[PDB]
Amino acid sequence: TMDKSELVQKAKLAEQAERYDDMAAAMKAVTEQGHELSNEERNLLSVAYKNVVGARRSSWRVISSIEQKTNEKKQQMGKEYREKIEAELQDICNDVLELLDKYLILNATQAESKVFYLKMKGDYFRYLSEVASGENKQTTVSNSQQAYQEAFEISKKEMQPTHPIRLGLALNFSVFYYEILNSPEKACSLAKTAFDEAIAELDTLNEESYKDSTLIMQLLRDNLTLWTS
């Protein structure tokens, strides 16, 4: 069929063509070969599914906004369309989660990769949580927290407070508290602590990632600035 480097090339093409389902299909196939992913492959996989699920999350939100309109077979039509989108979303997140649990998290050698993949797992259980209900929601919310927590603890121990992955994890975990658990309190607490710690140890920045670190440091302040109201 196609070998790793051909798949990776296809994935790069898809990306520029803005064909993200293709890009994800290619990176899904590379992952399924069962070898630890290079930093480049890892980021291609992440970008691909982020865009794939992002499109559905976006559509879900549009329809939801609309749905909040007082008639009702139009609200019955709109509800069924939201569910159709939700179902697509769930299939995407479950594909990713399966990839993470079957290949990525278990095989990750460096603390860096493990935190990255565990944060990813937090993210995609968080995306299920945005649209879940009933008992399913409790499950996805708890699994999201578990992955974020495990990654949180490992990063505090293994990475500098200015590492972009560590900061990104903190950004998303705090977003989890705010938007999913409805804990503005611990969200701002988490964001502010992560920012402060980074500020304190600005001497831990390095050449490869100092731009990414400062950008994420800035998103943390923005979220914080946006939430404290």
Binding site: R61, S64, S65, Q68, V175, Y178, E179, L215, Q218, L219, D222, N223, L226
Partner: peptide, 20 residues
């Protein structure tokens, strides 16, 4: 780079307005 920031602001703000 303000492109990332503004996009993040929009996405986050959506939650605040449309679902408190």
């Amino acid at each position: 780079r303000d492109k990332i920031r503004l996009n993040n602001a929009i996405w986050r703000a959506w939650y605040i307005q449309y679902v408190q």
